[PDB]
């Protein structure tokens, strides 16, 4: 019932500043509302901001981190020295400037930019957006971000401490549907993790289950595993999680339904967004976030591979009936 100066109708006056932030991010940060490297960097950032949260450290008399507190920006000098935070400073600086110019908290801005960026990627669900997180933060403790060479046990333990069940770890990894690497293997910059790095779809879950046959680069980078076709990169953590008895049935259940995947991801991102916070103390400004263009494409097994090339890892459920395609194997272009 609130009408912002802009003539947008919104639920609360605390949302009105976010319409200006929307316009700025879509023109500038997102280079005309695109789904390219900025959104992908922002998703690494939202994860690495929020996951600096450790009830186990708190329980052991230590600061455990403030979660989705914008610490990765406010204390970037410290946090961008962590192993998992390479290749982010240029994006962090862009966000810093936007937060200061519009006078919004860094923790809220990261969450907003996440929801806005997702909205530019076909097939995305509409992420919740809450405002009101204090701009105050202390540096995250070190060693809280899962790495691609970690065992499934280590990943589930860390994620579990933060608050996520194994199913939720799988659900959050839907973000690897919009993904590449730059820092693991320098010879294949922006090699995608799935065949559709600009579509928020189930391809990631399907393609990580295919037999690893292909070395996309002239050598291996850090935590790199064989992939199913030229141009695609596979990190060891994703390979293991796809196959591990603790995560494989949820991973398999993602393969055939973009709609269930999106719901699960939205729910898990909502939980992650308020690590360190009481969501009931925040204001819901989700109406600022528009819907994404719909994705009309069907799940597929690419390249004339079939279910026989799938390493079915959920021992109690048959692999879903997924369409196949013509060969030859594709060669993925670098993600834009
Ligand atoms: C569960 C453990 C996870 C591990 C070990 C992991 C590991 C990584 C690594 C090593 C990269 C490559 C970065 C580079 O070299 O450029 C990557 C990329 C990416 N990750 Fe994750 N990740 C995980 C979870 C997540 C989550 C929860 C999200 C966000 C919801 C996320 C979003 C992304 C995105 C979007 C990219 C692509 C970045 C790009 O294209 O520039 N990841 N991940
Ligand atoms: C959020 O807190 C940060 C850190 O104190 C503030 O960032 C500083 O902002 C000043 C004034 O604009 C800049 O001159 C500094 O470069 C910023 N420092 C860092 C580390 O980013 C920020 O202004 C605060 N935001 C709000 C809305 O109060
Ligand atoms: C096949 O072709 C793509 C480019 O079209 C590459 O990105 C890949 O590395 C392979 O050469
Ligand atoms: C991904 N970090
Ligand atoms: Ca943080
Ligand atoms: Ca995809």
Task: Give the C-alpha separation, 10 to 287, whole Å.
Answer: 7
The CATH number of the domain holding residue 79 is 1.10.520.10
Residue 3 lies in a domain: no
Residue recorded with tokens 């293997």: 185
Choosing from 97, 100, 105, 108 the residue with most ligand 2 atoms within 8 A of its CB, the one to mutate for a pocket test is 100
Task: Give the C-alpha separation, 276 to 141, whole Å.
Answer: 14
Whether residue 31 is found in the same domain as residue 139: yes
Task: Give the C-alpha separation, 75 to 139, whole Å.
Answer: 6
Atom of ligand 3 at shortest distance to CA of 217?
9
Experimental method: X-ray
Q: Identify the residues whose C-beta falls under 6 Å from ligand 3.
A: 188, 216, 230-231, 331-334
Task: Give the C-alpha separation, 75 to 97, whole Å.
Answer: 14
Whether residue 75 is found in the same domain as residue 199: no
Whether residue 275 is found in the same domain as residue 231: no
Q: What's the token pair of residue 247?
A: 């995560």
Strand, coil or helix: 140:
coil
Q: Is 176 annotated as a binding residue?
A: yes
Whether residue 197 is found in the same domain as residue 325: yes
Whether residue 172 is found in the same domain as residue 133: no
Resolution, Å (one decimal): 1.3
Whether residue 80 is found in the same domain as residue 47: yes
DSSP annotation of 333: P
Annotation says 102 is catalytic: no
Whether residue 17 is found in the same domain as residue 45: yes
Q: Identify the residues whose C-beta falls under 6 Å from ligand 1.
A: 37, 40-41, 43-44, 47, 87, 146-148, 155, 169, 172-173, 175-176, 178-184, 235, 237, 335
Whether residue 274 is found in the same domain as residue 125: yes
Task: Give the C-alpha separation, 44 to 220, whole Å.
Answer: 22
Residue 99 phi, psi (nearest 5): -60, -45
Whether residue 232 is found in the same domain as residue 152: yes
The CATH number of the domain holding residue 319 is 1.10.420.10
The residues, ordered by sequence, that sit 6+ positions from 327 with a Cβ below 8 Å of its Cβ are: 303, 304
Whether residue 323 is found in the same domain as residue 187: yes
Looking at the structure of the chain, the number of domains it has is: 2
Task: Give the C-alpha separation, 136 to 50, whole Å.
Answer: 14
Beta-bridge partners for 9: 3
Question: Which residues are found with C-beta within 5 Å of the ion, ligand 6?
Answer: 177, 194, 196, 199, 201, 203
Task: Give the C-alpha separation, 235 to 238, whole Å.
Answer: 6
Q: Over 68-88, what HEC string results? A: CCCHHHHCHHHHCCCHHHCCC
Which residue lies with its CA nearest to atom 3 of ligand 2? Answer: 74
Residue 7 lies in a domain: no
| Closest residue by Cα to residue 20 from 10, 46, 125 | 10
Q: Is 69 annotated as a binding residue?
A: yes
Strand, coil or helix: 21:
helix
Q: Is 194 annotated as a binding residue?
A: yes
Using an 8 Å Cβ cutoff, are 169 and 247 in contact?
yes
Pairing of strands 191-192, 180-181: antiparallel
Residue 86 CB–ligand 2 contact under 6 Å? no
Q: Is 23 annotated as a binding residue?
A: no
Indicate which residue of 40, 41, 44, 48 is catalytic: 48
Residue 32 lies in a domain: yes
Residue 2 lies in a domain: no
Whether residue 59 is found in the same domain as residue 74: yes
The continuous run of DSSP H or E covering 225 comes out as: strand 224-225
Instruction: Give the domain extent around 136.
Output: 12-145+269-296
Task: Give the C-alpha separation, 143 to 124, whole Å.
Answer: 30
Atom of ligand 2 at shortest distance to CA of 103?
27
Strand, coil or helix: 234:
strand
Residue 1 lies in a domain: no
Residue 49 lies in a domain: yes
Span from the CA of 297 to the centroid of ligand 4 (angstroms): 26
Using an 8 Å Cβ cutoff, are 82 and 49 in contact?
no
Q: Is 49 annotated as a binding residue?
A: yes
Atom of ligand 4 at shortest distance to CA of 176?
1
Whether residue 44 is found in the same domain as residue 98: yes
Is 59 exposed, middle or buried (CB count within 10 Å of its CB: 0-12, 13-18, 19+)? exposed
Residue 251 CB–ligand 4 contact under 6 Å? no
Cα distance from N-terminal residue to C-terminal residue, the chain: 40
Task: Give the C-alpha separation, 248 to 282, whole Å.
Answer: 35
Task: Give the C-alpha separation, 238 to 236, whole Å.
Answer: 5
DSSP per-residue string spanning 175-204: GGGS-EESSS-TTSTTEESSS-TTS-STHH
Using an 8 Å Cβ cutoff, are 324 and 305 in contact?
yes
Task: Give the C-alpha separation, 173 to 176, whole Å.
Answer: 6
Task: Give the C-alpha separation, 262 to 257, whole Å.
Answer: 9
Span from the CA of 59 to the centroid of ligand 3 (angstroms): 49
Residue 4 lies in a domain: no
Using an 8 Å Cβ cutoff, are 184 and 223 in contact?
yes
Residue 72 lies in a domain: yes
Q: What's the token pair of residue 303?
A: 């390249």
Span from the CA of 196 to the centroid of ligand 4 (angstroms): 18
> In the chain, how many H helices and how many E strands?
13, 8
Task: Give the C-alpha separation, 38 to 85, whole Å.
Answer: 15
Using an 8 Å Cβ cutoff, are 209 and 312 in contact?
yes
């Amino acid at each position: 019932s609130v009408t912002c100066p802009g003539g947008q109708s919104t639920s609360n006056s605390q949302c009105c500043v976010w319409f200006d932030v929307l316009d700025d991010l879509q023109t500038n940060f997102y280079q005309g509302s695109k789904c390219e490297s900025p959104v992908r960097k922002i998703l690494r950032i939202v994860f690495h901001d929020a996951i600096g949260f450790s009830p186990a450290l708190t329980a052991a008399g230590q600061f455990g981190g403030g979660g989705a507190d914008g610490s990765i920006i406010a204390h970037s000098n410290i946090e961008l020295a962590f192993p998992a935070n390479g290749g982010l400073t240029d994006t962090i600086e862009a966000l810093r400037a936007v937060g200061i110019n519009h006078g919004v908290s860094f923790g809220d801005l990261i969450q907003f930019a996440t929801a806005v960026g997702m909205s530019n990627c076909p097939g995305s669900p509409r992420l919740e957006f809450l405002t009101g997180r204090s701009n105050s933060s202390q540096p995250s403790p070190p060693s809280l971000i899962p790495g691609p060479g970690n065992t499934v046990t280590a990943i589930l333990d860390r994620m579990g401490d933060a608050g996520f069940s194994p199913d939720e770890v799988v659900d959050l990894l839907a973000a690897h549907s919009l993904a590449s690497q730059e820092g693991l293997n320098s010879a294949i910059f922006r090699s995608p993790l799935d065949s559709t790095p600009q579509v928020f779809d189930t391809q990631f879950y399907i393609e990580t289950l295919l037999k690893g046959t292909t070395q996309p680069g002239p050598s291996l980078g850090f935590a790199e595993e064989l992939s199913p076709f030229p141009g695609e990169f596979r990190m060891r953590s994703d390979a293991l999680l796809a196959r591990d008895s603790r995560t494989a049935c949820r991973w398999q259940s993602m393969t055939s339904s973009n709609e269930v995947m999106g719901q699960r991801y939205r729910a898990a991102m909502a939980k992650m967004s308020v690590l360190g916070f009481d969501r009931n103390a925040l204001t819901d400004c989700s109406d600022v976030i528009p819907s994404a263009v719909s994705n009309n494409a069907a799940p597929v097994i690419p390249g004339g591979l079939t279910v026989d090339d799938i390493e079915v890892s959920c021992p109690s459920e048959p692999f879903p009936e997924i369409a196949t395609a013509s060969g030859p194997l594709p060669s993925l272009a670098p993600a834009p």
